[PDB]
Design a protein around this ligand. Structure first.
Ligand SMILES: Cc1cc(C)nc(SCC(=O)c2ccc(S(N)(=O)=O)cc2)n1
Ligand SMILES: [Zn+2]
Length: 259
């Protein structure tokens, strides 16, 4: 049993052996060189319509925790921005560090943030998530950086349920969670074509990364770091440093919605 993860012998530098697309032409994350990102006056404002989002459950999957949504109806949708058509929210999750100085997957002029939130959405033209990931425009992931400072009040219900899903394969009911509480004020963004940042690393993602980070407290991110990558009754491996580092841009162009 030598499944992928985030250590010496199974972390990101090992993934190409099971998932050769790891060395592909549109892999994520990337460093966002803000001086080289082209302002693109044809980009539209991002449309985030989360009023009717229905969260269902929260799950420790052994790599992160996912807050899952009902996506059987057109309720929590992302559109506009660089996108054609309409993408439905299915789950969100985070990547974070063992220390405040690292943890994000994307970087901004090589700056690492303490964590990074991914709101994952699938293109409704493909009928469901599983079919969507097989298509080059199947997913739109909205990435939002976290820095440590003042608490994010909208985050606290998530933080408070983590002790209930400490270990791999634990889940809990998680209804009426409103993801609008996790958004910064500005929807200014950079966008580029890339991939899922975990295996299977499929090249199916339009990345939209917001320029404005949200602030979370030290106590909030400390609670993320009390999670476990192991299952109950196994030796404790703290769930930290579950981020993939920046991958080669390979001449793709990152576009900015601003400036
Ligand atoms: C492709 C695929 C098919 C099935 C049946 N399950 C999963 S779990 C991995 C995943 O859902 C996922 C979603 C978003 C990201 S990210 N980190 O790029 O936002 C990474 C993995 N993935
Ligand atoms: Zn992610």
């Amino acid at each position: 049993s030598h499944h992928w993860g985030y250590g010496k012998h199974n972390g990101p530098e090992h993934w190409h052996k099971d998932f050769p697309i790891a060395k592909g032409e549109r892999q994520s994350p990337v460093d966002i060189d803000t001086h080289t990102a082209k302002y693109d006056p044809s980009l539209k404002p991002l449309s985030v319509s989360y009023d009717q989002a229905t969260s269902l459950r929260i799950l420790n999957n052994g790599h992160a925790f996912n807050v899952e949504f009902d996506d059987s109806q057109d309720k929590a949708v992302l559109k506009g921005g660089p996108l054609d058509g309409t993408y439905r929210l299915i789950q969100f999750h985070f990547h974070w560090g063992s220390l405040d100085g690292q943890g994000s997957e994307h970087t901004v002029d090589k700056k690492k943030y303490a964590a990074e939130l991914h709101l994952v959405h699938w293109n409704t033209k493909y009928g469901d998530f599983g079919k969507a990931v097989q298509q080059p425009d199947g997913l739109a992931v909205l990435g939002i950086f976290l820095k440590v400072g003042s608490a994010k009040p909208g985050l606290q219900k998530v933080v408070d349920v983590l002790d209930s899903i400490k270990t791999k394969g634990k889940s809990a009911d998680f209804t009426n969670f409103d993801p609008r509480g996790l958004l910064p004020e500005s929807l200014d963004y950079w966008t580029y074509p890339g991939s899922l940042t975990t295996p299977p690393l499929l090249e199916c993602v339009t990345w939209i990364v917001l320029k404005e980070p949200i602030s979370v407290s030290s106590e909030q991110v400390l609670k993320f770091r009390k999670l476990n990558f192991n299952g109950e009754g196994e030796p404790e491996e703290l769930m930290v440093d579950n981020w993939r580092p920046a991958q080669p841009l390979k001449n793709r162009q990152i576009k900015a919605s601003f400036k």
